[model samples]
Target chain A: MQIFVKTLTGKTITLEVEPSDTIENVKAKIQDKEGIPPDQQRLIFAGKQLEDGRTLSDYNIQKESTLHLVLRLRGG
Target chain B: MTEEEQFALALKMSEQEAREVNSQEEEEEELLRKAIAESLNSCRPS
Candidate 1:
């Protein structure tokens, strides 16, 4: 199943992911879908920071769960 | 539906949605246009 993502620009998108899908995996899809690189994106769920290797299931990111997407600028 | 089937459906739609929301093409086009304008101005004789 897929969980939802709330973008910084206020768009809500359904991101295809599995229970076992890791944060890094979803980050790539967001990069593909939004043109926002993983290094420039901050993903948060349930007020907690989602780590790269952690699975969505580990965070209990169920269907309809909202993962907040925060945009960032890459500074030198 | 089975988990596999459901996963497939979600995946299918997500891909389409991903493409729909992608702004990379537009962003690149705008950047190119801006650069071209800047270049043209730079070459224009005062």
Candidate 2:
């Protein structure tokens, strides 16, 4: 199924994933496309933050659902 | 960004998408209704 990742700047990225895929797995895909590291990615769905260890199914995420991506701040 | 800022931005983004989804659904419903009304008018007598 396809889901969307919306960045803080209102950019949207579409990703193909399975219901059984973990949040960390999704982050890795995002890293590949957007060059943002998985550790710096935070995904939120349905008003709740997603856990790295949890699968999409665990959050009851549906096809075409939008997930918010906020980056973790790193002090240089 | 601060912790609060991050969550706020995420919430705003999510809400915007929800609004868009609602707009699209309403548009589709309107189009469907128009199509059905046109078909019915075309089939009417005289």
Candidate 3:
């Protein structure tokens, strides 16, 4: 399946995924492409945290959705 | 006109560039202060 997301800086990205992929899997993909690791890449949708336990479908997120992303102040 | 002359030119830039960088560092530090505050607030439960 094709997953689309927008970064905090207003950059939109298309993330390729399987229908069965979990939150952790998608985060790892983002981590590779964007360098924001799963921990530092804070993602929110529908006023809820997109924790690793759930499937991608659980959120009912479709294209044109707003995903709030915040890069954490991780001490480098 | 050898490697020493090229090295000399680079070192000459090393001074002015550093002085400009020293000035830019202050502005970046000011922005970092505000960002750090926002970073702390993000940790709170939503």
Candidate 4:
């Protein structure tokens, strides 16, 4: 399955993962690819959080699904 | 000449031209603001 990720800076990247891939695994992959810390990452699909420990299947994401991995901007 | 020289020449020309161009742009911006204000005023009931 393919997943398309986009950053807040409007840069897009695509990756392929197996159906059994968990959100934690995806987080690690994102960290490896973008150099962002895992704790600062937030996966959003259809405007909801794909929290840690949940599987892609839990969010009803299917093969070739696109997910956005955004780094949350904190602090005033 | 290198690409940097060409870029510098272009930048110099643009900067010289910008003095007049920027003044016109400011005038256009004022006209646009007035036009938008008029449009909004017409949209309300008399």
Query: What does DockQ give for each predicted structure?
Result: 0.01, 0.33, 0.03, 0.01
Name the weakest run of 10 consecutive residues (lDDT summed) in model 1 chain B: B37-46
Worst ten in a row by lDDT for model 4 chain B: B1-10
List, residue by residue over A1-76, the lDDT tens digit for candidate 2.
Answer: 9999888777889999999999999999998999998878888775678898999999888898999987766442
- Candidate 4: segments with Cα more than 4 A from true spot: B1-46
Identify the runs in model 1 with alpha carbons over 4 angstroms from their true place.
B1-46
Reference-based lDDT, each prediction: 0.72, 0.85, 0.67, 0.68
Q: Is candidate 3 or candidate 4 better by DockQ?
A: 3
Off by over 4 Å in 3: A62-66, B1-46
What does candidate 3's lDDT look like per residue over B1-46, in tens digits? 4999899899989998999989877865664454445434552323
Candidate 1: pairs in clash: none
Can you tell me the DockQ of model 4? 0.01
All candidates' TM-scores? 0.59, 0.68, 0.53, 0.57
- Estimate the Cα RMSD of every predicted model relative to the unseen true structure: 19.9, 4.3, 8.9, 16.4
- Candidate 4 lDDT over B1-46, as tens digits, reads 2434433443444345446656876999999998899888896765
Q: Please give the ranking of all candidate structures by TM-score, highest first, separated by commas.
A: 2, 1, 4, 3
Measured on C-alpha atoms, candidate 4 has an lDDT of 0.68
Docking class of 3: incorrect
Separate clash counts for every candidate = 0, 0, 0, 0
TM-score computed on alpha carbons, candidate 2: 0.68
How would you encode candidate 3's per-residue C-alpha lDDT over A1-76 as one tens digit per residue? 6766655465766787765778888789888888886877656665465778887678776644445554635635
The candidate scoring highest on DockQ is 2
